């Protein structure tokens, strides 16, 4: 019986105290230790070599204890380790083995979940150094890594990166790198107070599946000029995504460098999230260099129902090539998003845009294969002073993009800078249902609303519809002579255009092409013959050999005659129509006409 007291006070004591659930005689006859063994926390590994519990704190490195916990739970086939609430657990050294090649702190393991209720902080050992806090690779070479499966990080807790700046721009810093990750997720967690490259990365070069980031917060994760680049979540495996997250930055640097999400593989999504203070919303890109695990195509890409205040571009599309692989981007939907460029000076951050068709990382604009994109049902706003704002900046080759039923209220609709790239454009469709706002009315001196600074345009549709006047603009749409135009439809609705000197401008007279379908308003001077009765009127200019019909947009202030309501052309490039002289006499009028070709 001395034995007994001793057994009870020993670490095996709970293993000697019997228990049966709710006194139910049909329940298992267990011991207390069995029931306690159904859960596990960091406290069960956070101890010195004699087994005495160690209190966490800024002078204690909790890393080895958390790794021991993960290692042990993995050995039993998995479970969930709680990181207790009411404590801050500091990490103060690098991990060892396969994660050392990734500057890893903690190695995640398959089927071992982390329920983070307390706080995890980085100690100043990490100041000016690279780190990846949680790493799912098991090898320094990702190509030689095994997988991470069934690993979930969740809870009301916090990962705090200590505020430390990067030491050098070439360093990398990450929160969670799941690795070659299958059915992994982060839910509920706040990531805050750092200068990092990513908070979370999913997958590796297409290897992984079913990874998600849901109801997380990312707060103030760029803080220095050293930080080369930041994207909060990088989605690098298919069938994966980001939903219902919150992203906020306060740094000036973040306005120029930070992006919320990147979607880099097929069947990926970014939904229902709120962004503030970032340069960019999402990249949707197929990099050939990342094509190993899931193929060379990024398809079924979804960006929907987000709310954003950004300083650069909302969605950026891309694809590129390596020596032996070609990347393609297709079957994309961008819908339901409400986005604005935040208050800033013109040209003070990267050029503002809803959609950007961007060149590759080496600036090449002739490698892209981007098509079958639908942009529908979004709003975009930029304040009136922001000259550098567009619905699309089309800066690299485009094989198709469709715009239906958006509301764009910014400086430009379509833009590319002249004397830069000369993109080859196919299948650009701008439906009439896109509503062009008026915030930038009167700011457009010298500017074309649709500034078609391309090598060529084919199989494209631009149906311009104004909803207010802006007589400051040079034109609604302009094609330089260097842009070929063919098999396209270009129209300018007449509403709010009566007073415009130029509506559509074709500097190479490209509207004469055999398969160009156009219509736009123009002012035309006409003279008639002197005959009483039905009498022809003819334009004084001869630049209408391309016109198939025209009709009056002007009232007739005369009693004694009327000009033709409608006109055809003649071989010499005059317009001609049949009007009516009640009394004879040569007539001379200026009239606003709708000029039409093959429409
Ligand atoms: C910040 C960001 O995401 N920017 C986007 C561009 O990403 C490219 O540039 C970034 C710059 O940070 C990344 O390149 C850096 O990192 C890679 C990868 O790090 C190695 O492999 C890790 C698995 C490992 O843990 C590390 O220890 C490193 O060994 C490095 O190779 C580059 O030298 C370095 O500049 C990014 O790389 C991808 O990163 C994701 C997420 O971690 C990985 O899954 C991919 O495997 C990496 N891809 C490649 C080809 O290596 C670069 O792809 C991006 O291109 C553009 C367009 O979408 O947008 C930027 O915002
Ligand atoms: Na590495
Ligand atoms: Na509106
Ligand atoms: Na050209």
XYZ file of C-alpha atoms and ligand atoms in Angstrom:
663
model
C 0.000 0.000 0.000
C 3.078 2.293 0.126
C 3.381 1.059 -3.378
C -0.134 2.368 -4.046
C 0.380 5.945 -2.815
C 3.649 5.921 -4.751
C 1.895 4.586 -7.959
C -0.802 7.234 -7.655
C 1.647 10.114 -7.310
C 3.884 8.726 -10.132
C 3.370 9.606 -13.802
C 1.463 6.267 -14.158
C -1.016 7.261 -11.467
C -3.893 8.255 -13.712
C -3.432 4.853 -15.304
C -4.534 3.278 -12.052
C -7.700 5.318 -11.362
C -10.774 3.684 -12.841
C -13.464 5.392 -14.837
C -16.688 4.474 -16.547
C -18.636 7.077 -18.560
C -21.514 8.593 -16.609
C -21.609 5.474 -14.394
C -23.065 3.587 -17.330
C -22.665 -0.084 -16.661
C -22.643 -0.800 -20.433
C -19.650 1.538 -20.980
C -16.016 0.596 -21.157
C -14.129 0.148 -17.873
C -11.270 2.528 -18.538
C -8.652 4.436 -16.512
C -8.442 8.219 -16.261
C -5.224 8.260 -18.318
C -7.107 6.639 -21.256
C -9.591 9.491 -21.342
C -6.872 12.155 -20.953
C -4.964 10.444 -23.784
C -7.917 11.265 -26.191
C -6.535 14.857 -26.424
C -3.043 16.312 -26.604
C -1.581 19.795 -26.201
C 1.724 21.515 -26.361
C 1.861 21.208 -22.541
C 2.417 17.507 -22.961
C 5.796 18.107 -24.670
C 6.805 21.537 -23.293
C 9.115 20.218 -20.603
C 12.729 19.936 -19.547
C 14.808 16.781 -19.659
C 13.468 15.713 -16.228
C 9.879 16.112 -17.406
C 9.165 19.338 -15.543
C 6.822 21.723 -17.408
C 8.462 24.892 -18.774
C 6.422 28.168 -18.936
C 6.542 29.799 -22.418
C 7.759 33.323 -22.788
C 10.025 35.656 -24.713
C 13.149 34.002 -23.224
C 12.032 30.411 -23.979
C 12.325 28.744 -27.390
C 9.285 26.558 -27.815
C 10.353 25.075 -31.155
C 11.842 21.770 -30.035
C 8.754 21.083 -27.857
C 6.303 21.694 -30.653
C 8.307 19.593 -33.035
C 8.439 16.737 -30.472
C 4.638 16.971 -30.162
C 4.115 16.793 -33.939
C 6.593 13.946 -34.330
C 4.960 11.877 -31.632
C 1.353 12.411 -32.775
C 2.419 11.537 -36.356
C 3.825 8.221 -35.048
C 0.282 7.296 -33.859
C -1.440 8.003 -37.144
C -2.354 11.578 -36.522
C -4.518 13.731 -34.316
C -4.935 17.379 -33.337
C -2.414 19.263 -31.109
C -3.794 22.254 -29.250
C -1.593 25.358 -28.856
C -3.206 26.715 -25.727
C -5.034 29.938 -25.344
C -3.872 32.549 -22.797
C -0.164 32.085 -23.700
C 2.307 33.341 -26.265
C 4.602 30.609 -27.543
C 7.858 31.946 -28.921
C 9.959 30.335 -31.677
C 13.677 31.146 -31.444
C 15.769 28.742 -33.623
C 15.711 26.928 -36.975
C 14.482 23.358 -37.474
C 16.743 20.563 -38.664
C 16.799 17.968 -41.457
C 14.589 18.251 -44.576
C 13.177 21.692 -43.664
C 16.593 23.338 -43.247
C 16.848 23.898 -47.004
C 13.671 25.982 -46.711
C 14.823 28.009 -43.666
C 12.173 26.025 -41.872
C 11.220 26.404 -38.224
C 8.579 23.652 -37.673
C 8.014 20.591 -39.882
C 4.384 19.695 -40.412
C 3.456 16.045 -40.744
C 0.620 14.121 -42.359
C -2.668 13.782 -40.379
C -1.332 16.001 -37.623
C -3.534 19.053 -37.224
C -2.682 22.209 -35.244
C -5.471 23.924 -33.296
C -3.876 27.286 -32.627
C -5.826 29.045 -29.901
C -2.959 30.970 -28.350
C -0.315 33.077 -30.041
C 2.845 31.986 -31.861
C 5.503 34.679 -32.019
C 8.899 34.905 -33.592
C 11.798 35.887 -31.365
C 14.493 38.312 -32.406
C 16.804 35.518 -33.386
C 14.910 35.848 -36.692
C 15.512 39.579 -37.113
C 17.076 40.349 -40.585
C 17.025 36.594 -41.429
C 14.952 34.305 -43.758
C 12.417 31.919 -42.352
C 9.491 29.659 -43.157
C 7.541 29.069 -40.046
C 5.691 25.854 -40.859
C 7.014 23.621 -43.643
C 5.406 20.488 -45.115
C 8.295 19.485 -47.423
C 10.429 16.664 -45.962
C 13.453 17.279 -48.133
C 15.611 20.244 -48.936
C 14.944 19.567 -52.605
C 11.221 19.908 -53.251
C 11.527 17.531 -56.178
C 12.788 14.800 -53.830
C 10.151 15.568 -51.152
C 7.432 13.301 -50.022
C 3.896 14.625 -49.667
C 2.015 16.294 -46.816
C -1.552 15.004 -46.541
C -4.523 15.737 -44.286
C -2.914 18.617 -42.343
C -5.172 21.357 -41.027
C -4.217 24.466 -39.074
C -7.216 26.171 -37.449
C -8.380 28.229 -34.471
C -8.872 31.636 -33.043
C -5.162 32.216 -32.549
C -2.429 34.236 -34.087
C 0.916 33.923 -35.896
C 2.920 37.062 -35.249
C 6.116 37.616 -37.320
C 7.666 39.996 -34.763
C 7.781 43.090 -36.930
C 11.257 42.264 -38.146
C 12.406 43.624 -41.414
C 14.070 41.618 -44.122
C 17.818 41.729 -44.025
C 18.322 41.426 -47.749
C 15.966 41.534 -50.718
C 17.087 38.055 -51.882
C 15.830 36.432 -48.641
C 12.482 34.540 -48.528
C 9.986 34.517 -45.668
C 6.764 32.456 -45.375
C 4.154 31.556 -42.676
C 2.895 28.162 -43.854
C 4.442 26.246 -46.779
C 2.315 23.150 -47.055
C 4.653 21.640 -49.678
C 3.446 18.833 -51.975
C 0.157 19.175 -50.183
C -3.031 17.077 -50.432
C -6.156 17.983 -48.347
C -4.448 20.660 -46.265
C -6.024 23.865 -44.979
C -5.734 26.969 -42.821
C -8.917 28.311 -41.192
C -9.561 31.172 -38.749
C -5.973 32.192 -38.143
C -4.643 35.786 -37.966
C -1.226 36.304 -39.553
C 0.199 39.721 -38.583
C 3.071 42.114 -37.998
C 5.838 41.160 -40.451
C 7.905 41.758 -43.536
C 7.480 38.564 -45.515
C 7.286 37.184 -49.049
C 4.115 35.038 -48.519
C 1.922 34.186 -45.552
C 0.799 30.858 -47.006
C 1.785 28.781 -49.962
C -0.244 25.790 -51.223
C 1.255 23.022 -53.285
C 4.517 22.903 -55.235
C 4.726 23.296 -59.048
C 1.337 21.661 -59.530
C 1.826 18.869 -56.989
C -1.004 18.781 -54.425
C -4.768 19.034 -54.372
C -7.694 20.278 -52.239
C -5.814 22.930 -50.259
C -7.744 25.921 -48.876
C -7.416 29.136 -46.915
C -10.697 30.143 -45.309
C -11.670 32.914 -42.781
C -8.122 33.971 -42.196
C -6.867 37.504 -41.579
C -3.564 38.883 -42.906
C -2.579 42.167 -41.349
C 0.527 44.317 -41.945
C 2.801 41.775 -43.553
C 5.091 44.193 -45.471
C 6.985 46.912 -43.639
C 10.263 47.761 -45.388
C 11.958 48.917 -48.605
C 14.138 45.762 -48.487
C 11.208 43.427 -49.177
C 11.493 42.530 -52.851
C 7.958 41.287 -53.397
C 4.944 40.000 -51.509
C 1.988 37.838 -52.326
C -0.082 36.819 -49.312
C -1.347 33.417 -50.571
C 0.267 31.561 -53.453
C -1.896 28.773 -54.814
C 0.391 26.278 -56.586
C -1.739 23.130 -56.724
C -5.085 22.469 -58.419
C -8.512 22.040 -56.913
C -7.584 24.636 -54.245
C -8.475 28.181 -53.262
C -8.990 31.121 -50.934
C -12.427 32.080 -49.565
C -13.816 34.604 -47.064
C -10.465 36.097 -46.005
C -9.439 39.563 -44.920
C -6.214 41.237 -46.177
C -4.921 44.598 -44.941
C -1.676 46.515 -45.336
C -0.753 49.973 -43.998
C 2.786 50.363 -45.327
C 3.622 52.594 -48.241
C 5.768 49.777 -49.663
C 2.833 47.452 -49.823
C 1.100 49.837 -52.260
C 3.853 49.152 -54.737
C 4.807 45.561 -54.089
C 2.038 43.506 -52.367
C -0.573 41.212 -54.008
C -3.287 39.363 -52.036
C -3.513 36.055 -53.911
C -1.911 34.174 -56.792
C -3.709 31.440 -58.665
C -1.131 29.321 -60.570
C -2.829 26.011 -61.367
C -6.137 24.794 -62.805
C -9.395 24.582 -60.887
C -8.488 27.306 -58.396
C -10.488 30.128 -56.901
C -10.428 33.400 -54.930
C -13.840 34.308 -53.536
C -15.642 36.467 -50.975
C -12.619 38.256 -49.621
C -11.846 41.859 -48.610
C -8.559 43.592 -49.498
C -7.253 47.020 -48.382
C -3.855 48.698 -48.877
C -2.350 46.346 -51.466
C -0.876 47.045 -54.851
C -2.628 44.093 -56.485
C -5.596 41.784 -56.036
C -4.714 38.556 -57.793
C -2.314 37.128 -60.344
C -3.914 34.384 -62.517
C -0.876 32.990 -64.346
C 0.311 29.677 -65.895
C 4.111 29.655 -65.527
C 5.717 26.959 -67.719
C 8.329 26.620 -64.995
C 5.549 25.452 -62.595
C 3.914 22.910 -64.943
C 5.361 19.652 -63.581
C 2.572 18.338 -61.304
C -0.666 19.304 -63.034
C 0.136 20.067 -66.684
C 0.809 23.149 -68.767
C -2.647 24.660 -68.659
C -4.329 26.874 -66.068
C -8.052 26.510 -66.706
C -11.188 26.910 -64.495
C -9.838 29.935 -62.725
C -12.346 31.878 -60.625
C -12.082 35.372 -59.072
C -15.494 36.258 -57.640
C -17.388 38.397 -55.212
C -14.311 40.182 -53.657
C -14.166 43.667 -52.272
C -10.954 45.649 -52.786
C -9.148 48.963 -52.352
C -5.827 48.625 -54.213
C -3.288 50.993 -55.755
C -2.225 49.061 -58.850
C -4.081 46.254 -60.698
C -6.894 44.099 -59.561
C -6.431 40.931 -61.701
C -3.266 40.303 -63.680
C -3.296 37.581 -66.370
C -0.238 35.812 -67.715
C 1.319 32.807 -69.313
C 4.821 32.066 -70.442
C 7.309 29.492 -71.816
C 10.548 27.748 -70.887
C 12.890 26.042 -73.264
C 10.695 22.879 -73.375
C 7.272 23.735 -71.929
C 4.635 26.204 -72.971
C 2.140 27.649 -70.448
C -1.472 28.424 -71.380
C -4.231 30.292 -69.552
C -7.868 29.775 -70.532
C -11.377 29.395 -69.094
C -11.238 32.191 -66.524
C -14.121 34.023 -64.881
C -13.867 37.364 -63.049
C -17.299 38.288 -61.639
C -19.129 40.141 -58.910
C -16.070 42.039 -57.653
C -16.322 45.641 -56.389
C -12.930 47.341 -56.662
C -11.414 50.781 -56.410
C -8.085 52.449 -56.755
C -7.420 54.143 -53.414
C -6.762 57.822 -53.064
C -3.342 58.605 -54.576
C -1.562 60.874 -56.959
C -1.414 60.023 -60.616
C 1.570 57.821 -61.461
C 2.468 57.346 -57.763
C 1.986 53.537 -57.817
C 1.847 50.933 -60.609
C -0.636 51.820 -63.350
C -4.103 51.375 -62.116
C -6.268 48.722 -63.788
C -9.121 46.313 -63.298
C -7.565 43.725 -65.635
C -3.908 43.765 -66.746
C -2.548 41.535 -69.519
C 1.008 41.627 -68.322
C 4.279 40.583 -69.964
C 6.334 37.721 -68.468
C 8.852 38.173 -65.617
C 11.560 39.061 -68.184
C 9.294 41.662 -69.846
C 8.453 39.570 -72.914
C 5.056 40.339 -74.501
C 5.160 37.737 -77.270
C 4.958 34.437 -75.313
C 1.464 34.545 -73.865
C -1.429 32.189 -74.679
C -4.400 33.732 -72.818
C -7.985 33.134 -74.029
C -11.520 32.350 -73.082
C -11.751 34.809 -70.267
C -15.051 36.222 -69.071
C -15.149 39.533 -67.090
C -18.731 40.177 -66.055
C -20.799 41.935 -63.472
C -17.944 43.826 -61.736
C -17.662 47.470 -60.629
C -14.462 49.494 -60.794
C -13.826 53.025 -59.680
C -10.796 55.338 -59.676
C -10.820 58.894 -58.432
C -10.806 61.624 -61.132
C -7.181 62.703 -60.675
C -5.769 59.228 -61.399
C -4.697 59.536 -64.994
C -3.199 56.037 -64.832
C -6.411 54.069 -64.453
C -7.975 51.671 -66.980
C -10.577 48.990 -67.229
C -7.876 46.929 -69.072
C -4.266 47.575 -69.598
C -3.490 45.305 -72.544
C 0.288 45.101 -72.568
C 1.082 41.661 -74.003
C -0.334 39.341 -76.619
C -3.981 38.439 -76.004
C -5.846 35.543 -77.588
C -9.223 36.450 -76.074
C -11.016 38.289 -73.329
C -14.766 39.026 -73.055
C -16.315 41.935 -71.107
C -20.047 41.887 -70.451
C -22.199 43.990 -68.112
C -19.511 45.670 -66.071
C -19.485 49.209 -64.718
C -16.094 50.876 -65.280
C -15.548 54.365 -63.881
C -11.958 55.343 -64.576
C -9.739 57.326 -67.000
C -9.358 54.756 -69.818
C -11.457 51.794 -70.954
C -8.794 50.050 -73.073
C -5.174 51.260 -72.786
C -1.661 50.405 -73.748
C 1.220 52.900 -73.695
C 2.367 54.071 -77.098
C 5.961 53.394 -78.072
C 6.058 50.412 -75.648
C 4.944 46.907 -76.466
C 2.836 46.260 -79.521
C 0.572 43.447 -78.572
C -1.142 41.132 -81.048
C -4.793 41.165 -80.067
C -7.427 38.549 -81.015
C -11.006 38.053 -79.720
C -11.175 41.175 -77.504
C -14.959 41.529 -76.943
C -16.345 44.742 -75.253
C -20.118 44.364 -75.210
C -22.493 47.338 -75.321
C -23.761 46.379 -71.859
C -20.553 47.740 -70.259
C -21.403 51.031 -68.588
C -18.745 53.744 -68.794
C -18.874 56.066 -65.774
C -18.368 59.784 -65.635
C -15.986 60.455 -62.777
C -13.179 61.368 -65.270
C -15.392 63.647 -67.470
C -13.453 66.808 -68.316
C -10.107 65.285 -67.388
C -9.356 63.691 -70.753
C -7.647 66.468 -72.762
C -5.406 64.830 -75.301
C -6.609 61.332 -74.414
C -8.463 58.526 -76.211
C -10.996 56.652 -74.110
C -10.129 53.437 -75.951
C -6.449 53.910 -76.913
C -5.783 50.950 -79.298
C -1.921 50.971 -79.149
C -1.503 47.504 -80.555
C 0.299 45.768 -83.432
C -2.971 44.414 -84.678
C -6.578 43.699 -83.700
C -8.651 40.847 -85.179
C -11.951 39.190 -84.361
C -12.686 41.927 -81.885
C -15.730 43.881 -80.859
C -15.769 47.341 -79.235
C -19.279 48.734 -78.702
C -18.794 52.157 -77.078
C -21.727 53.516 -75.138
C -21.323 56.764 -73.170
C -23.701 57.670 -70.312
C -22.688 61.339 -69.963
C -20.768 63.885 -71.952
C -17.027 64.263 -71.880
C -16.033 66.786 -74.513
C -12.480 66.978 -73.126
C -11.441 63.672 -74.724
C -9.681 63.628 -78.033
C -11.728 60.627 -79.257
C -13.813 57.754 -77.959
C -11.643 55.217 -79.787
C -8.404 55.654 -81.763
C -6.360 53.267 -83.855
C -2.824 54.471 -84.782
C -1.773 53.712 -88.394
C 0.584 51.082 -87.091
C -2.304 48.916 -85.769
C -3.800 46.629 -88.347
C -7.521 46.072 -87.892
C -9.527 43.305 -89.577
C -12.621 41.094 -89.048
C -13.833 43.398 -86.286
C -16.827 45.424 -85.176
C -16.301 48.973 -83.806
C -19.314 51.150 -82.922
C -19.828 54.444 -81.137
C -23.392 55.034 -79.963
C -24.461 58.587 -80.700
C -25.770 59.477 -77.228
C -23.787 62.303 -75.562
C -21.610 62.637 -78.761
C -23.291 65.507 -80.671
C -20.649 68.021 -79.795
C -17.588 65.823 -80.212
C -15.194 66.694 -83.070
C -13.865 63.193 -83.183
C -15.673 60.036 -82.136
C -13.853 57.108 -83.777
C -10.432 57.784 -85.320
C -8.655 55.405 -87.727
C -5.275 56.982 -88.360
C -4.460 54.423 -91.099
C -8.013 54.542 -92.476
C -8.447 50.942 -91.290
C -12.221 51.185 -91.176
C -12.118 50.630 -94.955
C -11.142 46.974 -94.536
C -13.312 44.443 -96.288
C -14.366 42.735 -93.043
C -14.477 45.774 -90.790
C -17.960 46.605 -89.500
C -18.213 50.120 -88.037
C -20.521 52.948 -87.236
C -19.861 56.320 -85.608
C -21.070 59.930 -85.777
C -19.476 62.593 -87.958
C -20.252 66.104 -89.183
C -20.596 66.370 -92.969
C -20.942 69.378 -95.272
C -23.333 68.805 -98.177
C -24.349 70.810 -101.268
C -27.385 70.094 -103.547
C -28.187 70.628 -107.134
C -30.572 73.464 -107.981
C -33.519 71.397 -109.231
C -36.935 71.902 -107.778
C -38.424 68.724 -106.423
C -36.548 65.552 -105.553
C -32.931 66.673 -105.604
C -29.577 65.119 -104.786
C -27.277 66.295 -101.996
C -23.550 65.436 -102.155
C -20.788 65.712 -99.580
C -18.134 68.336 -100.286
C -15.397 65.986 -98.985
C -14.411 62.748 -100.647
C -13.309 60.611 -97.672
C -16.439 58.333 -97.561
C -15.622 55.612 -100.066
C -15.934 53.078 -97.182
C -19.431 54.142 -96.120
C -22.339 51.777 -96.857
C -25.070 54.060 -95.489
C -25.448 57.137 -93.334
C -28.413 58.816 -91.701
C -29.295 62.164 -90.206
C -28.707 62.919 -86.555
C -29.687 66.630 -87.056
C -32.945 68.499 -87.285
C -33.793 70.503 -90.428
C -34.399 74.167 -89.596
C -35.649 74.906 -93.183
C -39.146 75.185 -94.587
C -38.288 75.390 -98.296
C -36.248 72.181 -98.537
C -35.041 69.142 -96.680
C -31.766 67.261 -96.950
C -31.886 63.500 -97.412
C -32.683 61.469 -94.335
C -30.329 58.730 -95.571
C -27.279 58.541 -97.803
C -25.162 56.059 -99.776
C -21.768 56.694 -101.311
C -20.181 57.083 -104.785
C -16.971 55.780 -106.233
C -15.165 59.093 -105.690
C -15.785 58.931 -101.981
C -18.690 61.380 -101.806
C -21.856 60.689 -99.919
C -25.058 61.108 -101.887
C -28.731 61.148 -100.995
C -32.094 62.337 -102.327
C -33.710 65.257 -100.581
C -36.526 67.602 -101.538
C -36.515 71.177 -102.812
C -40.035 72.641 -102.383
C -38.583 75.610 -104.194
C -35.468 75.339 -106.290
C -32.053 76.510 -105.478
C -28.549 75.182 -104.642
C -28.529 74.286 -100.915
C -25.557 74.058 -98.563
C -25.882 72.413 -95.130
C -23.797 71.005 -92.334
C -25.335 67.943 -90.782
C -24.477 65.437 -88.038
C -24.676 61.928 -89.546
C -24.325 58.406 -88.290
C -21.828 56.856 -90.678
C -22.180 53.131 -91.172
C -20.137 50.422 -92.799
C -21.706 46.988 -93.252
C -23.964 47.544 -90.201
C 6.261 37.032 -54.160
C 5.670 36.409 -55.345
O 4.976 35.391 -55.242
N 5.799 37.035 -56.565
C 5.179 36.604 -57.776
C 6.118 35.866 -58.728
O 6.691 34.740 -58.153
C 8.019 34.498 -58.615
O 8.858 35.275 -57.800
C 8.792 34.974 -56.407
C 9.658 35.967 -55.649
O 9.578 35.673 -54.270
C 9.124 33.533 -56.079
O 10.549 33.333 -56.445
C 11.343 33.137 -55.259
O 11.124 31.855 -54.710
C 11.406 30.716 -55.552
C 10.936 29.477 -54.792
O 11.747 29.326 -53.578
C 12.473 28.083 -53.642
O 11.580 26.948 -53.675
C 10.752 26.841 -52.456
C 9.830 25.631 -52.700
C 11.698 26.693 -51.270
O 10.993 26.607 -50.041
C 12.630 27.863 -51.164
O 13.538 27.612 -50.056
C 13.412 28.145 -52.433
O 14.360 27.092 -52.592
C 12.925 30.750 -55.902
O 13.238 29.663 -56.706
C 13.166 32.020 -56.642
O 14.596 32.144 -56.839
C 12.800 33.230 -55.751
O 13.029 34.461 -56.432
C 8.238 32.617 -56.898
O 8.611 31.247 -56.875
C 7.557 30.280 -56.651
O 7.237 30.322 -55.268
C 6.171 29.419 -55.016
C 5.718 29.606 -53.610
O 6.728 29.456 -52.657
C 6.620 28.022 -55.260
O 5.528 27.148 -55.072
C 7.104 27.818 -56.700
O 7.739 26.532 -56.819
C 8.038 28.921 -57.162
N 8.148 28.960 -58.590
C 9.270 28.865 -59.224
C 9.212 28.979 -60.738
O 10.315 28.671 -58.606
C 8.295 33.016 -58.410
O 7.372 32.258 -59.205
C 5.326 35.484 -60.006
O 6.085 34.870 -61.027
C 4.528 36.729 -60.596
C 3.536 36.299 -61.667
O 2.495 35.519 -61.090
O 3.844 37.464 -59.619
C 4.588 37.861 -58.484
O 3.774 38.628 -57.669
Na 15.515 26.370 -50.529
Na -22.758 52.646 -61.247
Na 1.179 46.545 -86.872
